[PDB]
């Protein structure tokens, strides 16, 4: 390095550099696989946020909707 700091030059502070890179190609690939999973989930989340709630679902969607018993208890308790 060509240090430009007065304190660095005075005290001889150094930026030690390893001989070998910390992570290997396989480790970087695994991290990238996890990042890809994150990206897919994030795209799905962005789509959901963009489209918001769909109150029409009760007209065509399968099932009859459900409220968890704890959610019902919270509703009964109130705010």
């Amino acid at each position: 390095r060509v240090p430009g700091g007065k304190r660095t030059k005075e005290l001889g502070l150094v930026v030690p550099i390893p001989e070998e890179d910390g992570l290997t190609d396989g480790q970087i690939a695994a991290l990238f696989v996890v990042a890809l999973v994150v990206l897919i989930a994030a795209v799905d989340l962005a789509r959901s946020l963009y489209f918001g709630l769909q109150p029409n679902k009760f007209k065509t969607a399968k099932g009859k909707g459900s409220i968890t018993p704890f959610m019902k208890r919270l509703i009964e308790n109130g705010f």
């Binding site: 390095r1 060509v2 240090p3 430009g4 700091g5 007065k6």
Partner: protein, 261 residues
């Protein structure tokens, strides 16, 4: 900086709450804290303005007195008010800590001098003026003597026209815009204080009583390595810092355009 941003954010969102959330009672009714505050918002703002004016007048005047006397070469003529209250609090804290030790704390206690007193009063001025602007925006967001019907309009609107004498920067968002400059100033003052006392404790203690010390011993003196980073002689590891120093200067100057024209 993050703390200052969050504080001004809390103020801005309180103003927005008043604009579009608070359900004000009828005028004569005074039952909630917000209504009680709105009853004497004028007194609040006038007293805050008085405090800000006092702090600014006296801090700037003492600094200018010291500046002129130092320029004429007579440090003995400087007004140097010893920080007796802060020193007493610090001595009590040190007494408690010493008792605990008898039963190290570094940087929790610092020498504290008249320069510290002046800088603390400057920072108090900054805080008081920022709060003045934000409180005025919040308490005039719903209505004002100049614009009584400000509830109907959005949180941020351009103006109300050149009539009624002119209505630039009449919205609560415009008060936030204005208080943002102050936040940046008061935060710059705080950061300059910390950085100067950190770099040169002794020089800060002896010379921080007049503004030329801040302008010369802190900015001009310590600006050398950054500007010298890259030149015709060569470059060093601070060249990136020197290019971002100038890029940001240019960004500031560009902001001047949208602010003025």
């Amino acid at each position: 900086y993050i703390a200052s941003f969050l504080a001004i954010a809390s103020h801005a969102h309180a103003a927005i709450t008043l604009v579009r959330d608070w359900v004000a009672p009828l005028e004569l009714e005074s039952s909630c804290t917000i209504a009680r505050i709105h009853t004497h918002k004028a007194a609040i703002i006038s007293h805050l303005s008085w405090v800000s004016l006092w702090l600014g007048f006296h801090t700037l005047a003492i600094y200018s007195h010291n500046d002129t006397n130092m320029a004429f070469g007579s440090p003995s003529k400087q007004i140097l008010i010893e920080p007796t209250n802060a020193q007493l609090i610090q001595e009590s804290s040190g007494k408690a800590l010493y008792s605990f030790a008898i039963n190290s704390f570094g940087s929790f206690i610092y020498p504290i001098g008249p320069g510290d007193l002046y800088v603390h009063h400057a920072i108090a001025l900054g805080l008081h003026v920022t709060v003045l602007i934000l409180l005025k925006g919040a308490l005039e967001a719903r209505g004002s003597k100049l614009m009584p019907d400000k509830m109907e309009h959005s949180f941020g609107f351009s103006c109300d026209g050149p009539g009624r004498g002119g209505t630039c920067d009449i919205s609560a968002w415009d008060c936030f815009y204005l208080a943002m400059f102050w936040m940046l100033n008061t935060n710059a003052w705080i950061d300059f204080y910390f950085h100067y006392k950190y770099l040169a404790p002794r020089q800060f203690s002896e010379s921080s009583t007049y503004l030329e010390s801040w302008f010369r011993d802190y900015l001009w003196f310590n600006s050398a390595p950054l500007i010298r980073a890259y030149s015709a002689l060569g470059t060093n590891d601070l060249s990136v810092q020197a290019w971002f120093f100038l890029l940001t200067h240019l960004a500031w100057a560009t902001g001047f355009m949208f602010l003025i024209s």
